[PDB]
Design a protein around this ligand. Sequence first.
Ligand SMILES: *[C@@H]1O[C@H](CO)[C@@H](O[C@@H]2O[C@H](CO)[C@@H](O)[C@H](O)[C@H]2NC(C)=O)[C@H](O)[C@H]1NC(C)=O
Ligand SMILES: *[C@@H]1O[C@H](CO)[C@@H](O[C@@H]2O[C@H](CO)[C@@H](O)[C@H](O)[C@H]2NC(C)=O)[C@H](O)[C@H]1NC(C)=O
Ligand SMILES: CN(C[C@H](N)c1ccccc1)S(=O)(=O)c1cc(F)cc(F)c1
Ligand SMILES: *[C@@H]1O[C@H](CO)[C@@H](O)[C@H](O)[C@H]1NC(C)=O
Ligand SMILES: [K+]
Ligand SMILES: [K+]
Length: 498
Amino acid sequence: ARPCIPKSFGYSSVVCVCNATYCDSFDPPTFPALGTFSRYESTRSGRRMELSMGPIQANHTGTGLLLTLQPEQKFQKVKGFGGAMTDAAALNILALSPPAQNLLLKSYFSEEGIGYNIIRVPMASCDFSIRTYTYADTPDDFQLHNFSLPEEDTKLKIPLIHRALQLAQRPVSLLASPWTSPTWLKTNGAVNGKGSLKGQPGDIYHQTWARYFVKFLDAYAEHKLQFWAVTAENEPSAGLLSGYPFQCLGFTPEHQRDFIARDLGPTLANSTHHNVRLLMLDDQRLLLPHWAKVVLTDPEAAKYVHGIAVHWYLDFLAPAKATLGETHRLFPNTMLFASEACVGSKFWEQSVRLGSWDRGMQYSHSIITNLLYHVVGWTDWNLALNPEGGPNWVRNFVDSPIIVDITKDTFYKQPMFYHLGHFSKFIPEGSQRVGLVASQKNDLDAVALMHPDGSAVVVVLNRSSKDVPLTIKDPAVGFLETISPGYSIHTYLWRRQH
Ligand SMILES: *[C@@H]1O[C@H](CO)[C@@H](O[C@@H]2O[C@H](CO)[C@@H](O)[C@H](O)[C@H]2NC(C)=O)[C@H](O)[C@H]1NC(C)=O
Ligand SMILES: *[C@@H]1O[C@H](CO)[C@@H](O[C@@H]2O[C@H](CO)[C@@H](O)[C@H](O)[C@H]2NC(C)=O)[C@H](O)[C@H]1NC(C)=O
Ligand SMILES: CN(C[C@H](N)c1ccccc1)S(=O)(=O)c1cc(F)cc(F)c1
Ligand SMILES: *[C@@H]1O[C@H](CO)[C@@H](O)[C@H](O)[C@H]1NC(C)=O
Ligand SMILES: [K+]
Ligand SMILES: [K+]
């Protein structure tokens, strides 16, 4: 419907420019008729989710790369894709004119955009905040009579979440995560630094903290917002670290285990919010499988844990097979979910690289890696940041898929936006990952899924410089003859009849 307005800032690719009167957008989603496939293509050279169609052919000859769909080899079902409504994201969005705000929210949450269905909501302040606060800063209020949502929630986050919900045709799921407790519940009496809850699981401090989760859900419910899930703590390992610079709350895996078993689990289960799922860990993958072993081998904790949330810091290397793979092998019935991902956090790299194709490829390669290790969903960090990668009260700036420039009432959609959208737009909630078998060794990254209605989707990423001819075979349907250009990403979709 409206194409990308490209702009280069000197990096390897372009951003797409939106403003008060223009943003790139799709027509209302429709499938091609039976016997045709759709291909959406983005390239470093500058194509952005461009649609072309081709025939599904009865026959294929030749010795080229064949990817055969394995529609009956079924793996995990998918919860979805989205990003985080931090204070920083909300401040950036609301600094835009109403029109530009709307085109930004449509980019992410409408079918004219990339159809996000997950929003992560911090419980009070984090590093991506300009104010340090909790919902219960009045000291020694153990019954939490003075628990309340400040304007960061009531004026910024909650109204934006409501507007995202109005634009979406897909049901949107909310996920809540706390960074710090009130300081009067903590050993160090500070929002940051090395510190945990005082006392031990099952006592007044731990019970007050569990009750704070319920008060949080109660308060959002008064605003007509219900949550799909909460995590047990954002990055619990961070609060074990001397000098930790921003909001945290330290738990060892044993501390998390006992807090869940004695306090958080029972308190949620006994509330009106008992159907809210509880996710453990919410932290980096090298803590697995150990953390999962500690928590999930205790039946009193295990009965309350619905999944394991993992963070992906895409700037750094870590094993996936020995972490996610081993966790899935040991605990196949506990879902894995990616609750936070980001790039640009190294102090020596520019936090925001406008038009970086490399950071786009980091996003899609991570998503593919996650899906191939049984992960059910993938959640970006801040939905929008400024050109500095902020605001952030400790200057812990990073990149975001959308960068707001309030001096021009403009926002820039990064390659990361398009790389995420190649998945989010085309993988509805309830889709199931299926197998995809290569006839020969090749340099491509790929994943296949089946939609709830039986339709196929395949994503193909080419991080190499070489154009790679290939054929996709759907044994029930026929062959898709195509090409994967160097530095491209493609999403293929087609109807399946038997
Ligand atoms: C928002 O951006 C659009 C697209 O860049 C601007 O419209 C362009 O304006 C230039 C200069 O007049 C023309 O050469 C283009 O033909 C226009 N493009 C389109 C698609 O209309 C628009 O002026 C910007 N709006 C605001 C409020 O700054
Ligand atoms: C478990 O659930 C019941 C409600 O079904 C909670 O009972 C209420 O507790 C609060 C204080 O926490 C009182 O102000 C209410 O008067 C109680 N209402 C009823 C109907 O009993 C109970 O406290 C919950 N257990 C917890 C939070 O540990
Ligand atoms: C190992 N694969 C790459 C190989 N060239 C390939 C491509 C297509 C069909 C089969 C195999 S992969 O399964 O696609 C994969 C696994 C990962 F763990 C992370 C990836 F990014 C990608
Ligand atoms: C496919 O293969 C068979 C020959 O083996 C042929 O009859 C048919 O015409 C071929 N072409 C198409 C387009 O089906
Ligand atoms: K308060
Ligand atoms: K940086």
